[PDB]
Amino acid sequence: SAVKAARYGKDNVRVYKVHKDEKTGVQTVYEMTVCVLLEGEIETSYTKADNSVIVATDSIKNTIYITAKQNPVTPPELFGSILGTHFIEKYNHIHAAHVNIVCHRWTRMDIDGKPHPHSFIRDSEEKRNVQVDVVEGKGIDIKSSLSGLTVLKSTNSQFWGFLRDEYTTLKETWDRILSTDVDATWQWKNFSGLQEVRSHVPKFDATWATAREVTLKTFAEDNSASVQATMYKMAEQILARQQLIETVEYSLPNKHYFEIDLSWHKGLQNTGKNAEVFAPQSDPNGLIKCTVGRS
Amino acid sequence: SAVKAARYGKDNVRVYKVHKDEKTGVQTVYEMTVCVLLEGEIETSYTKADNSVIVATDSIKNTIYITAKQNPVTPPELFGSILGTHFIEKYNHIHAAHVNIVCHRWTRMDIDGKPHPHSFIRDSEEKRNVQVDVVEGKGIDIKSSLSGLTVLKSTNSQFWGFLRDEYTTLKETWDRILSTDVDATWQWKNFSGLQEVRSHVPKFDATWATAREVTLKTFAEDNSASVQATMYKMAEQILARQQLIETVEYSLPNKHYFEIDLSWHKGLQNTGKNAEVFAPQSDPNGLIKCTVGRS
Amino acid sequence: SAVKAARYGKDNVRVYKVHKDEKTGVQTVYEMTVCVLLEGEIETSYTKADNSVIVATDSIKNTIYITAKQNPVTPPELFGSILGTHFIEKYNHIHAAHVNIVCHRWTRMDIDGKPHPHSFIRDSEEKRNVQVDVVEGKGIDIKSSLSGLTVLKSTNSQFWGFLRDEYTTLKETWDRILSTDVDATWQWKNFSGLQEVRSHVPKFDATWATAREVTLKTFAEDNSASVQATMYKMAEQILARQQLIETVEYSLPNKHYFEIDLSWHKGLQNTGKNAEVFAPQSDPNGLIKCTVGRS
Amino acid sequence: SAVKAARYGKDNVRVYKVHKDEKTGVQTVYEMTVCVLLEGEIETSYTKADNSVIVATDSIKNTIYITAKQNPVTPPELFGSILGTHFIEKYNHIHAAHVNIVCHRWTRMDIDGKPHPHSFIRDSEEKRNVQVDVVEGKGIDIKSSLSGLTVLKSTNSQFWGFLRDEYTTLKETWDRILSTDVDATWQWKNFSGLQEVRSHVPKFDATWATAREVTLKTFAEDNSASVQATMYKMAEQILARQQLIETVEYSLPNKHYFEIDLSWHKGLQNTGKNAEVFAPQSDPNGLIKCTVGRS
Ligand SMILES: O=c1[nH]c(=O)c2nn[nH]c2[nH]1
Ligand SMILES: O=c1[nH]c(=O)c2nn[nH]c2[nH]1
Ligand SMILES: O=c1[nH]c(=O)c2nn[nH]c2[nH]1
Ligand SMILES: O=c1[nH]c(=O)c2nn[nH]c2[nH]1
Ligand code: NA
Ligand code: NA
Ligand code: NA
Numbered sequence A, B, C, D: 001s002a003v004k005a006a007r008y009g010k011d012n013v014r015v016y017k018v019h020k021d022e023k024t025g026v027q028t029v030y031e032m033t034v035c036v037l038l039e040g041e042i043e044t045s046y047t048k049a050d051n052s053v054i055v056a057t058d059s060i061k062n063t064i065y066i067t068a069k070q071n072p073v074t075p076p077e078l079f080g081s082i083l084g085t086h087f088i089e090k091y092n093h094i095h096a097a098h099v100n101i102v103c104h105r106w107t108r109m110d111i112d113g114k115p116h117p118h119s120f121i122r123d124s125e126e127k128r129n130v131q132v133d134v135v136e137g138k139g140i141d142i143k144s145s146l147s148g149l150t151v152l153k154s155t156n157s158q159f160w161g162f163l164r165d166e167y168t169t170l171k172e173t174w175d176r177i178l179s180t181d182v183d184a185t186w187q188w189k190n191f192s193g194l195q196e197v198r199s200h201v202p203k204f205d206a207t208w209a210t211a212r213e214v215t216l217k218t219f220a221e222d223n224s225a226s227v228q229a230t231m232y233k234m235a236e237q238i239l240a241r242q243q244l245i246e247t248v249e250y251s252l253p254n255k256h257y258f259e260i261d262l263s264w265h266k267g268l269q270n271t272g273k274n275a276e277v278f279a280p281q282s283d284p285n286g287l288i289k290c291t292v293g294r295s
């Protein structure tokens, strides 16, 4: 037998950082969960019990805290690139670092119409994420994403004209509820190293904001022919607005809300044009994915 | 042996309702999870296999949908009271109904600075809940709550002057992070029946809004001496603003964020006044509760 | 305003203890999650910011570890009683302690047909729990439970003869699937104090084992007329076998498995006597509760 | 813009099947959660709103039930291969099907020392899974796995001799607790089609059993030098016992249990050789992965 692939590290490292502006008294908080996995010349730890090649996962944890102390943690694309580069530069036998960061929302509270200097609310479990792969001699690959953005529209969604055969019971419809949890990932062109990532720092927050805005507006405004058609429109717009993105991937559940026929009860009308009360379905769910790139 | 207590019904009934304004084209959605448990002269279903006394749980489910079709579902205090009253009036041998409702957030989207007519976002997993107990001959008892409101302040929290003995290692502090998930319940005076609940309908949404606003403002503005002291201030204000509330109960976890001593690494200073990076603790957590009523 | 009730403490304290037999080399592990909430003359911490009455929750955490170091942690009824008694005896102004313990399964592995001395498996998320309320001058109240015991029988369950009215669509049946997650609690007679709890130590594990065995056998063997009727039979037997139990409470979801009519597809027969493939329903679910005590 | 990749289908389809032996009266149940995603000439549904190429996800759901009605559902490798093959053969424009199956445990109850004919218990949340990729013209690729197997050993684990630098605080140890949740995947050689999968049917259950047995025995018996070294030993043995496996992948969290220094309290000794009470850590956790293949 032989080791074909190996990676190891520390997962679920929770980190909080506060920035305090001494002039204005305003404080800003960041909270993240970080995972770092390393690859390199470490096969002997598996095959020969040679621990000398192992940077202990506990040390990886310490490094994450030290790195957060000495560097900005925002945008996460930059922090991830700093953290990954550290491992490949510090350890001769480590040749790749894989850094995953999930950013949790702490939104400044408005109290009596004014932004509070040091109080925050978790407004939704929507996350902003990064995956950064730093590979010695091959640069830095970054995938940025938003996830856990849950939306619903109560009309202006249709689904008709699909294939009908002996396995089909679904009725065509010209008016249905559409609800999903949005998972959207944009993949940046490969960066040569940390200097290049630093040079594009302003684009990271701006592109996240654009991806979010395009997703919300397109969902709200499209008279949707299907999840497939609406999601493609979203991806097309993101690619048009940021030339440094190579691909956009969406993964969307179709969270179904079923009509309830109540006509058995005193002829109560609750279907088609008369539908008011619906039964949300926990499972099963449609799952629709697409990766859109450039011509 | 004898049956000392029994209740049964249907849990986890998901319900969605849409309201469509034909004039303006504006749609409004409501989504809830409902549980209804019944009590009454049903002991024989347990002791003698006498199913004749059982209103099937499936029928309870149907009733929830029918009731939502024929009545407003907001405020939830009213819907719960209608639903509970139905069971005690319809079935001679059912003498109490216990209705729990969890309301999920669907907040209207703003697209380009204007409210969208039919698109919604789940902004946080904060819930608005009701517990309604309808007991034949004893009226309607309603407990309203908010839950899952997660907040953090990065300064203006202290904790010193507590008991110190041979079990104590905790250092006194004059500046710490305070974070919690708020669970707040207000209990209404007993209502004689549905007519009285209807007469107070406007107070339900207003009191929820007040409870939320008082919670947020007090948390943000109090230079907190302890969770105990800050939570009491919240409860006192709610009772002062709504005379029809008898008690307010808060249940608050103290979600700890620990300093990380990095001084072992190149004398790095990250404690006390120099603390910037902290480790959020998933467990254990403090848990502090209080019920505040009138003199 | 006035404080009507208050309690506070530490939740989610994870504890592991190992016992090592030096003679045989056999090791035995215990893992628990513990919550301790205190009550007493602590109102001033809420109303006057008087922290002098507060035993810090951090100290409560330390006490749990120290107590586990110096005492047996099994049976949990005994450990809970020791832990609760500590607080009411040590602190003059603390008058009640409420201790909740969840015991996690670590079952010794059998390797090649023999019990391994120091290797364990988590066989299911079934828990054994205790709630112990120690109240100064009123003794020790203990409720023991098992929870998370998930079972299914594929036949020998019926449900017919229930009330039928204009809200009813459920068909009567003489053969259905019955599946539930068992939550069963037995409440002990009040104990005068720790000496009395110690005197009954052997009864705690034996009664847990009996409750489990009665639950499983009754479920498997009863040709069930309803959840109500089968659960009553379980409770009756437990009360008959342990005279020191005052009441038994069961709380049982009815986890539904629906027939799927496939007759639209080539006349495929999959209902009634021909039913082979079913759709498990995640929600809603029936919820049936009963508390059984002595004549 | 262009569609680079697309797949869509139905997720979270819960399925139960019962087998009834008329001769013996013995019933056997199977419960699974199934996901099927399709690929093929479907780009126009995304780019042109052309739904004619879409096999509706609802139809995919129906197909899963129909297929389970007409075929054995065990071993899951066979059922997955039947289900995937169906889609590529039935629809000219569908060229790949991706089938994921999670099998839930329903273990026959022993009542009074004998196997019960129709009563079952969920003994642990351990799962047996399959991923089957059926690609037109490229055969059938199957990855089989077990997951959610949670184990702990209280001694006979060591970790010393790792890299020490200015980021390291971890002490070397010759005796620690080792606990993990096992995720193990074995990848079969490519099969030419359904006939070949059928020819190997007996190997699927046998290899699952072997993988499980090797995992448990190796964990229990290895005086472990690291997670890396123990996991490699497991993978090596599986590859030796089944020649039709090409690779074995393990992904193992290192779930830490920390010593608690109690020496501040009356000189209590609870570290090193005296350690009895430990604090399980929910996070962070080590994560160690390896893929082992043939020379
Ligand atoms: O088994 C281990 N492997 C590792 O890589 C490691 N790092 N810290 N502790 C550890 N234990
Ligand atoms: O066992 C049952 N008890 C009930 O009360 C019920 N209601 N619907 N189905 C049911 N099954
Ligand atoms: O606000 C607090 N209240 C308490 O009771 C406590 N105990 N430890 N830390 C604490 N913080
Ligand atoms: O938008 C949809 N896309 C689909 O592929 C589908 N299949 N069923 N319903 C559906 N809705
Ligand atoms: Na390197
Ligand atoms: Na009545
Ligand atoms: Na006392």
Ligand code: NA
Pocket: D087, D088, D089, D090, D091, D092, D093, D094, D095, D136
């Ligand atoms: Na095909």
